Design an enzyme around this catalytic site. Structure first.
Site, short mmCIF file in Angstrom:
data_model
loop_
_atom_site.label_atom_id
_atom_site.label_comp_id
_atom_site.label_asym_id
_atom_site.label_seq_id
_atom_site.Cartn_x
_atom_site.Cartn_y
_atom_site.Cartn_z
N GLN B 235 1.14 -1.74 0.11
CA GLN B 235 0.02 0.02 0.04
C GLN B 235 1.15 1.41 -0.39
O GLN B 235 0.68 2.02 0.09
CB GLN B 235 -0.65 0.31 1.39
CG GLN B 235 -1.98 -1.20 1.41
CD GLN B 235 -3.62 -0.93 2.22
OE1 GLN B 235 -3.38 -1.98 3.06
NE2 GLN B 235 -3.68 0.27 2.53
N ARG B 382 -9.89 -0.40 7.68
CA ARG B 382 -10.85 0.96 7.76
C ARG B 382 -10.66 0.92 9.00
O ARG B 382 -12.00 1.89 9.20
CB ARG B 382 -12.28 0.63 6.83
CG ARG B 382 -11.88 0.29 5.29
CD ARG B 382 -13.25 0.79 4.56
NE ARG B 382 -13.47 -1.05 3.42
CZ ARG B 382 -14.37 -0.31 2.29
NH1 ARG B 382 -14.44 0.96 2.53
NH2 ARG B 382 -14.39 -1.75 1.76
N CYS B 383 -9.68 1.75 9.51
CA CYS B 383 -9.57 2.03 10.68
C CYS B 383 -9.86 3.93 10.81
O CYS B 383 -10.10 3.86 11.63
CB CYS B 383 -8.55 1.51 12.14
SG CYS B 383 -7.42 1.36 11.46
N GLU B 758 -12.95 4.91 4.05
CA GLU B 758 -13.37 3.77 5.86
C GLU B 758 -14.81 4.73 6.73
O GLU B 758 -14.75 4.51 7.93
CB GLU B 758 -12.13 4.03 6.40
CG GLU B 758 -10.52 3.58 5.63
CD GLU B 758 -9.35 4.28 6.72
OE1 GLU B 758 -9.36 5.10 6.61
OE2 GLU B 758 -8.92 3.08 7.40
N1 MCN Z 1 -13.99 14.11 -1.76
C1 MCN Z 1 -14.31 12.28 -2.34
C2 MCN Z 1 -13.47 11.51 -1.64
C3 MCN Z 1 -13.25 10.32 -2.17
N2 MCN Z 1 -13.64 10.00 -3.56
C4 MCN Z 1 -12.75 9.03 -4.55
O1 MCN Z 1 -13.20 7.99 -3.64
C5 MCN Z 1 -12.09 7.12 -3.81
C6 MCN Z 1 -11.22 7.12 -2.20
O2 MCN Z 1 -10.56 8.33 -2.04
P1 MCN Z 1 -9.90 8.29 -0.56
O3 MCN Z 1 -11.87 8.83 0.40
O4 MCN Z 1 -8.95 9.41 -0.48
O5 MCN Z 1 -9.39 7.08 0.18
P2 MCN Z 1 -8.02 6.17 -0.49
O6 MCN Z 1 -8.43 6.21 -1.82
O7 MCN Z 1 -6.58 6.45 0.28
O8 MCN Z 1 -8.23 4.72 0.57
C7 MCN Z 1 -8.46 4.12 1.29
C8 MCN Z 1 -9.31 3.56 1.86
O9 MCN Z 1 -9.46 2.72 0.98
C9 MCN Z 1 -10.40 1.77 1.56
N3 MCN Z 1 -11.72 1.21 0.36
C10 MCN Z 1 -10.96 0.26 -0.33
N4 MCN Z 1 -12.30 -0.33 -1.37
C11 MCN Z 1 -10.84 -1.20 -2.05
N5 MCN Z 1 -11.32 -1.81 -3.20
N6 MCN Z 1 -9.84 -1.79 -1.93
C12 MCN Z 1 -9.41 -1.44 -0.61
O10 MCN Z 1 -8.23 -2.20 -0.32
C13 MCN Z 1 -10.08 -0.17 0.38
N7 MCN Z 1 -9.21 -0.83 1.82
C14 MCN Z 1 -9.70 0.92 2.19
C15 MCN Z 1 -9.19 1.60 3.24
S1 MCN Z 1 -8.65 0.70 4.30
C16 MCN Z 1 -8.03 2.65 3.11
S2 MCN Z 1 -7.62 3.74 4.17
C17 MCN Z 1 -10.76 7.30 -4.48
O11 MCN Z 1 -10.85 7.04 -6.01
C18 MCN Z 1 -11.37 9.16 -4.85
O12 MCN Z 1 -11.40 9.89 -5.59
C19 MCN Z 1 -14.59 11.36 -4.17
O13 MCN Z 1 -15.32 10.48 -5.28
N8 MCN Z 1 -14.29 12.78 -3.28
#
Ligand code: MCN
Ligand code: FES
Ligand code: FES
Ligand code: FES
Ligand code: FES
Lengths: 161, 804, 287, 152, 158, 286
Positions: B235, B382-383, B758
């Site tokens: 990751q 997802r903590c 999360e």
């Molecule tokens: N305001 C926002 C926030 C997010 N997004 C979109 O949603 C997606 C997730 O963005 P974000 O919330 O920034 O999270 P991360 O991409 O940093 O993902 C990490 C988060 O992701 C989670 N969801 C998961 N989903 C999948 N498929 N796989 C994992 O391993 C996952 N692991 C979990 C865990 S644990 C974590 S820590 C991104 O394409 C982002 O552009 C959006 O459209 N608008």
């Protein structure tokens, strides 16, 4: 080693295998068809599912020698020769039915047989009908939508919303 | 159409706010993803472990002779091969060490003891069976509440003298750390004098992230070149590079880490595992590649667990329901080695967001970590760095306080919400929340589910139960939560000394298409789709003309990876800021070409026009060619930019989740009737992707609250660590989800966007658990500990006398 | 995950399979659908040197009407059982039970004979076969014999089969037209072995129960035929006082395991609840 | 032509150019330019050319142009990094940038030569303790438009 | 196809080959030993030189069937088992005896035999001795130096 | 670069090879060192259906003196000729000539018999063998016979050999002790065929030439034996006037190609200059 002859994605295959070689590993490691995946060691997840002589089979729970003479379809065999994707491949994209894509080959291969078993399933029939396939990403909701989309495309008419 | 309108041009971009279909799906639906076990290299061997059958034992000896003599076996490593090295232990992100191969003793069942390297995984498996290990068993510790008793077993002999660990003084051989924050003296005075004091001990039981793809790598030391290539389920690939450099002594320019497509992570794939270290050492020794791919049983029992917090949680209030203070103590079970991923200064993560969505003047939190004979971890699944636990503590405490006050818990929340005008809001354990409109969201949720009516329905059903007309009870679960995501500011967020910034590099080609890379790493969250949307809108270049990459440490700019829902807060910001640098250069180019002042130009979706003279314009595509064909004299040729973004604060998304749960008190079987989830993550990049993140997270929350567990018996045997018992729901069990939103932007973020990924797990677990506890409240069950599976809810009713 | 090496055999007839099993001894196992045996080979709980695959033996697959029975070949798959319109007409409880076993993929491969011969108290067919009063047809080097399903199971993975024998078919007496039936299973999720389950077949005339039989799944080291529980139902109206006596008699023969499905006491009580629910559904169907 | 240089937290370097060697020794010589400019050993620098996905855009190797164009870009990109390192050193040492001077592999405080920060320490600081006014990291690009030909 | 058995870099090799397959293609294409190179179609350049039963052979002017039973060394076989470069490999680096690297495998394989034929050659003997090998980059001067450097290192070994 | 397909044979004896050639017919060719044949296969100028490799026939390799001759097996390599100290003592012109042929790799494989039987006028050995008055031993299905080298070459790739015959050995009269010798070659670079070359052997007594024989390489469509040119040296001091007469008589019999090596007129003159230089070096050695 054992001598096997079979058909995979419509093409003849001839090979030598050990009896203990799992079908999943013959497919991945010898035939280089790496779409099928391994997600478990106890036969629950379905990531390894292929279509074999008209059946959905968890290929981690079968030896390659058991598939002598069989016809197998893997995810690589689903798209049309003109490049165009199958109804199910298209529905999985349109409906956001995958994220990491790890379960997706097995999900589509199971669904391909499900829609032959039952071309117009209800939502409950879909959910039960893919009970052998685990997904960690989607929470299944969009996968049901994907399969409904593919059914409606195949049938020329929609059923449930 | 040759001259499309501004709206038509914007639509074609498929930029911010659009439900853009995913680019990843083309290869993944066709089996043409590239995941670690798909990698095949010339000469590649397979490695795997001999693992410990014992939870706690001295190793008297290991006999590898029969294994080494088997045809097709190339190596068998034990601690003795690594110990000259100092690679028999590895550093962890928590500042402790973890055994790579067991040396003097084993400390948890299934711990790595030897590493066999063979022609293939079938020969490796044969050879592992031929290794013989002789053990001398030792008294086992599995109960953390007994870990610091005077006769508790001495686990960590290797640090018996070390009374200061990585996080301050240790008070007992099995104590890892004590961490505290808040106003102790003011909180104690408030509790000593308050009208009402509401106290419970809530356990957040041990579970596991169980990604469908397990942990794995392919290590390739090129001994001709002196360069290591490492494919793996990372990751945080750049962090892994820097760690492997520190451990191996190879310099970073000669370590090529590649995180390819990853079959889910969910926090399992943040840190390093023994398998990675041993594959790398084996490949260095043998000079050929070495692949390691674990099986499920080993994944569940030996890689990062989640949760395992025992939270003594108190609220002080007036009889009328004003909350005066919160006091929380956590006993944290870390297993045998502290491998808990976290920013280095935060050994209990962000557990200090546990005052939640409420305005209270003072609070105090204390956490003690302890060692036990179990696998390591804690932070996973997802903590958001212990925010799952923080939210559970407060949202459960709201419910037990409401029961004691004889008040409706929705009214208690409403009476105490931080109000929209109070943001940015300094909470009493130190976090400054960025923005929030909690009354609006709570009202929308309550209106959607018909809350007031549901309470009348419930009262009637309770009366029917008492009249003997039904054996079903109804619960209404509420979870109103404040997340904290986007680690984080350089002042106090770092991973082993590297500040928690992230990054973007964007390069425009002469013909107007784009290559862009970021320091994060998707494991299915759609980054290859959504980062392109942010760029598209900033630059007026269609998202399809933009290629996004992550995960190759030779090529992507350095970042801190994907966890903590940080990608959008950090690299999403960097992407916007880098794109804005390009736009500023393009504006300069346009002004030169059009022979006007910059301040006379205005932007219209994808072009700069001259104010008052719209027929005089240059499109971004034209400017991109000009930057290579006719660079203005004072400017460099080309059109590209980088940004490394140090965030000013975290982002604080929120939600309002409501669950209706029906329960058969005679079998203990519960069934979700309805689940509604409102999330507010500020500006929404891709609503389709957000919705899928929510459906996935809610399904995890369901699983955790209603059935999942990893357990240990008194002998230290790990129980339920296979899909024979570990509750991973199928499509049949998984509820249908209803989702909704509001938009309250982050004022400090370049595009107003907060993280979200999360949120659904963080808020969902208390919502499910609150619905179960609520169903039983009229029967005076008290706090019911998770998981809420059928035998356990049967037991609750048995002890209440419901089955007489 | 990785089984130990073995030699692989494809006998062409029942007689050749039996001869082979007889020759090769305990080192050899019959291979049917493989969906219990291959998982335990993969954990090396089983390490056979020989697998005798029954797949080329056409005679072992089928559903036939013969005399007053239905005779089902041991290699008949769960999927085939569910798809049989004939079985749905004459023995509807089979489809109901099969649909509660495993998942679609497993049901395409797993066989009725493998489910019955396995010896795992978790399997659902055994107690169903005891409820139905089925007989198992065995062929070995010493010729053919029959053993009642009620007498086939002695312990966990401990059955009446002898060295060199194959279970070749299951013979099931056809119940009366209009009988009631139900299989009621309590499970943690799809694909899980029962916390407790009950199989019921009964008949009614004029508001009274005429016959009843009850099987209990996974609440002892074997399936159980709850003989006394079914007997006490005969002559009654199958109401709550009649059921109370049946429940007591069923609980008293259980001796469940304590595992992730809960404590033994819970499992015993759930045998009673499943029995009540099964009886009620069967009563509604009977007519 | 062009150069992109990126310094890693521990002080080794990946650099790419828009040219393409066919035996002229670029993978050796471009590193020598950077080594002198920044005081980083040449073996701590990786040079790459020829992959259009990863190398910055350039016009290739012909006309004996590599040293005039990408060689110039290499020096100028390295001097952008140097300039940022000076600002990091100023922040660390609590002095004005104008008070610092370069000495081979470190910035020293004028008149107080015992007070210094090495390029290696500055590279680590750019990741570990980035000055708040500045972006983290330590890297640069230059696309070099030559003012004239060279006439050997 | 003909069944051949031979040794390459000390390892047994067994293969089926058409008789018309040139030895250079058997080595590059079937054996994946791609150090040996093709520089011409008329047998002049020497880029394809291998050591074969004690001889320097242009492998583009031999069929694989002719190598049945032979022992062949290619450039991959020159380093020691512990990875250490041969004296010739080290000398080519120290003396700048290569630029593009394309003639280098063949030059070193010829030179390996040259120094067995004559362990202490004069410059005229070296230049004549490598007459079968063309280089486009170096102008030969540093190759002569690399060979002399390697002769000195070898002659110090005993 | 790529030859057409063929079958490949490894006969174990001369008799077996001759039988196989005779049976297979025109479509079969002997394969010796392969360094003329394989290059013209690769261009598809030659498209034989069969190759008959002589590798396993030990009796085709070797150098021996027998009576007043040295007898050299056809499969003896250029590298072996150079390495023979017996040959250097008795026939030192051969080492001198061989060192002017091709390059080290080609010399490890190419054979004296393949060089003599080829019929490429570029090959050096033919005119040397004519100078020396060598005899070629041929064995075919009709038995053994002998053809003088002076009578063996009729044109480009046209020689006296018949269907099914192998050249098994070259029989060379040994010149007197003390004879003079030289092979003088003009070429564009290492590995090239001659612009012109001359082979000379001669003996002297009392300051006067007693015997002299001259061969000319690559200045006609065959090698040439310059009979008259040698004759006119006998009885002379090998002084300017004698050499000018020999040059005229040698030049007169040339008929060179005009190619990348230069036009016919240059190559005729160069045959004369090579002859002069060869006689001078031979005279000094005598
Ligand atoms: N305001 C926002 C926030 C997010 N997004 C979109 O949603 C997606 C997730 O963005 P974000 O919330 O920034 O999270 P991360 O991409 O940093 O993902 C990490 C988060 O992701 C989670 N969801 C998961 N989903 C999948 N498929 N796989 C994992 O391993 C996952 N692991 C979990 C865990 S644990 C974590 S820590 C991104 O394409 C982002 O552009 C959006 O459209 N608008
Ligand atoms: S890999 Fe999980 S069922 Fe096959
Ligand atoms: S898409 Fe990730 S497991 Fe299903
Ligand atoms: S490739 Fe040129 S001599 Fe062989
Ligand atoms: S080094 Fe380039 S051809 Fe010799």
């Amino acid at each position: 080693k054992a001598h096997i002859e079979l058909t995979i994605n419509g093409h003849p295959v001839e090979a030598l295998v050990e009896p203990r070689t799992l079908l999943i590993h013959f497919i991945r490691e010898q035939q280089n068809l790496t779409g099928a995946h391994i997600g478990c060691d106890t036969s629950h997840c379905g990531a390894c599912t292929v279509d074999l002589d008209g059946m959905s089979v968890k290929s981690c729970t079968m030896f390659a020698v058991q598939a002598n003479g069989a016809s197998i379809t893997t995810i690589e065999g689903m798209a049309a020769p003109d490049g165009t994707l199958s109804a199910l491949q298209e529905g999985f994209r349109m409906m956001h039915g995958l994220q990491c894509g790890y379960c997706t080959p097995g999900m589509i291969m199971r669904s391909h047989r499900l829609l032959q078993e039952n071309p117009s399933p209800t939502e409950a029939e879909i959910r039960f009908g893919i009970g052998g396939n685990l997904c960690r990403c989607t929470g299944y909701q969009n996968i049901v939508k994907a399969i409904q989309y593919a059914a409606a495309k195949i049938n020329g008419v929609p059923f449930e919303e | 159409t040759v001259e499309p309108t501004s709206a038509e041009r914007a639509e074609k971009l498929q930029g911010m706010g659009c439900k853009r279909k995913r680019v990843e799906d083309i290869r993944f639906t066709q089996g043409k993803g590239n995941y670690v076990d798909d990698v095949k290299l010339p000469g590649m061997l397979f490695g795997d472990f001999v693992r410990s059958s014992h939870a706690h034992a001295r190793i008297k000896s290991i006999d590898t002779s029969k294994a080494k003599a088997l045809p097709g076996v190339f190596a068998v490593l034990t601690a003795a091969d690594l110990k000259p090295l100092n690679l028999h232990y590895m550093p962890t992100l928590a500042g402790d060490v973890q055994a790579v191969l067991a040396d003097e003793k084993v400390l948890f069942q299934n711990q790595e003891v030897a590493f066999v390297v063979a022609k293939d995984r079938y020969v490796a498996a044969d050879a592992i069976e031929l290794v013989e290990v002789d053990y001398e068993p030792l008294p086992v510790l599995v109960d953390p509440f007994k870990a610091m008793e005077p006769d508790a077993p001495l686990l960590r002999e290797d640090i018996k003298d070390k009374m200061t660990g990585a996080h301050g003084a240790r008070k007992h051989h099995n104590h890892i750390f004590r961490w505290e924050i808040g106003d102790k003296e003011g909180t104690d005075a408030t509790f000593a004098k308050a009208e009402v004091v509401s106290k419970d001990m809530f356990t957040y039981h041990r579970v596991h992230p169980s990604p469908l793809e397990t942990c794995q790598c392919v290590a390739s030391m090129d001994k001709i070149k002196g360069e290591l290539t490492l494919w793996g389920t990372f990751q945080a690939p750049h962090v892994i590079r820097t760690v492997v450099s520190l451990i191996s002594g190879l310099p970073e320019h000669k370590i090529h880490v590649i995180a390819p497509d990853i079959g889910g992570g969910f926090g399992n794939k943040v840190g390093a595992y023994s398998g990675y270290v041993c594959a790398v050492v084996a490949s260095i020794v043998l000079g050929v590649p070495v692949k390691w791919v674990e099986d499920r049983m080993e994944n569940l029992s030996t890689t990062s667990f989640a949760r395992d917090y025992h939270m003594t949680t108190e609220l002080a209030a007036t009889k009328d329901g004003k909350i005066l203070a919160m006091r929380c103590h956590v006993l944290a079970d870390h297993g045998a080695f502290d491998a808990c991923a976290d920013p280095s200064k935060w050994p209990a993560g962000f557990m200090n967001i546990c005052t939640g969505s409420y305005d209270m003047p003072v609070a105090h939190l204390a956490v003690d970590g302890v060692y036990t004979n179990k696998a390591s971890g804690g932070v996973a699944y997802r903590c958001s760095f212990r925010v799952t636990e923080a939210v559970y503590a407060i949202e459960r405490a709201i419910e037990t306080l409401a029961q004691r006050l004889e008040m409706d818990s929705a009214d208690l929340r409403i009476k105490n919400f931080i109000q929209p005008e109070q943001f940015p809001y300094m909470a009493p354990l130190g976090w400054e929340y960025d923005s929030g409109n909690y009354p609006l969201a709570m009202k929308k949720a309550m209106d959607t589910v018909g809350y007031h009516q549901l309470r009348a329905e419930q009262k009637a059903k309770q009366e029917a139960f008492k009249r003997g007309e039904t054996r079903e009870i109804m619960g209404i679960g509420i979870s109103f939560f404040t997340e904290i995501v986007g680690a984080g500011p350089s002042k106090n967020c770092d991973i082993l000394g590297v500040s928690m910034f992230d990054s973007a590099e964007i390069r425009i080609h002469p013909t107007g298409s784009v290559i862009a890379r970021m320091g994060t790493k998707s494991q299915g969250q759609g980054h290859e789709t959504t980062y392109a949307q942010i760029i598209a809108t900033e630059l007026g270049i269609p998202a399809d003309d933009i290629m996004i990459e992550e995960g190759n440490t030779d090529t992507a700019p350095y970042g801190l990876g994907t966890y903590g829902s940080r990608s959008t807060p950090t690299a999403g910001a960097a992407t916007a800021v880098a794109a804005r640098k390009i736009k500023a250069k393009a504006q300069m180019i346009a002004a030169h070409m059009l022979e006007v002042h910059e301040g006379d130009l205005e932007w219209d979706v994808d072009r700069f026009r001259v104010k008052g003279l719209p027929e005089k314009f240059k499109t971004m595509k034209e400017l991109a060619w000009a930057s290579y064909n006719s660079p203005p004299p004072n400017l460099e040729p080309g059109l590209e930019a980088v940004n490394y973004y140090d965030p000013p604060n975290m982002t604080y998304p929120f939600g309002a989740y409501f669950c209706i749960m029906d329960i058969d008190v005679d079998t203990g079987v519960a069934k979700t009737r309805r689940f509604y989830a409102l999330d507010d993550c500020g500006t929404r990049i891709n609503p389709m992707i957000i919705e899928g993140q929510v459906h996935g997270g809610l399904t995890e929350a369901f699983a955790v609250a209603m059935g999942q567990e990893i357990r240990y018996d008194e002998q230290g045997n790990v129980l339920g660590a296979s899909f024979m018992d570990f509750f991973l729901p199928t499509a049949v069990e998984t509820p249908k989800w209803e989702t909704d939103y509001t938009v309250t932007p982050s004022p400090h973020h370049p595009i107003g966007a907060k993280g979200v990924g999360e949120s659904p797990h963080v808020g969902g677990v208390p919502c499910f658990s609150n619905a179960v506890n609520d169903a039983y409240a009229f029967l005076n069950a008290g706090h019911i500990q998770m998981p809420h599976d059928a035998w356990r809810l049967w037991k609750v009713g048995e002890q209440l006398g419901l089955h007489v | 995950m990785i089984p130990g090496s073995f030699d692989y055999h494809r006998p062409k007839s029942i007689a050749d399979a039996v001869a082979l099993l007889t020759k090769l001894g305990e080192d050899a196992r019959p291979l049917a659908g493989g969906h219990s045996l291959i998982p335990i080979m993969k954990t090396r709980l089983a390490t056979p040197e020989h697998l005798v695959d029954l797949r080329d033996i056409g005679d072992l697959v089928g559903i036939r009407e013969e005399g007053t029975d239905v005779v089902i070949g041991a290699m008949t798959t769960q999927h085939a059982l569910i798809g049989s319109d004939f079985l749905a007409a004459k023995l509807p409880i089979i489809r109901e039970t099969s649909l509660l076993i495993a998942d679609p993929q497993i049901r395409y491969m797993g066989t009725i004979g493998g489910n019955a011969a396995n010896g795992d108290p978790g399997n659902d067919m055994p107690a169903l076969m005891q409820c139905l009063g089925a007989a198992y047809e065995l062929t070995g080097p010493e010729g053919a014999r029959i053993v009642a399903a009620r007498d086939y199971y002695q312990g966990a993975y401990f059955t009446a089969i002898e060295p060199g024998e194959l279970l070749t078919a299951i013979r099931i007496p056809v119940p009366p037209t209009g009988h009631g039936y139900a299989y009621e299973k309590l499970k943690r999720k799809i694909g899980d072995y029962a916390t407790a389950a009950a199989a019921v077949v009964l008949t009614m005339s004029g508001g009274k129960c005429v016959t009843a039989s009850i099987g209990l799944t996974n609440v002892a080291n074997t399936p159980l035929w709850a003989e006394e529980a079914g007997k006490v139902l005969v002559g009654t109206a199958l109401d709550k006082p009649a059921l109370d006596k049946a429940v007591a008699l069923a609980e008293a023969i259980t001796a469940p395991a304590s595992d992730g499905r809960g404590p033994a006491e819970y499992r015993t009580k759930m045998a009673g609840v499943m029995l009540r629910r099964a009886v009620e559904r069967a009563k509604a169907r009977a007519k």
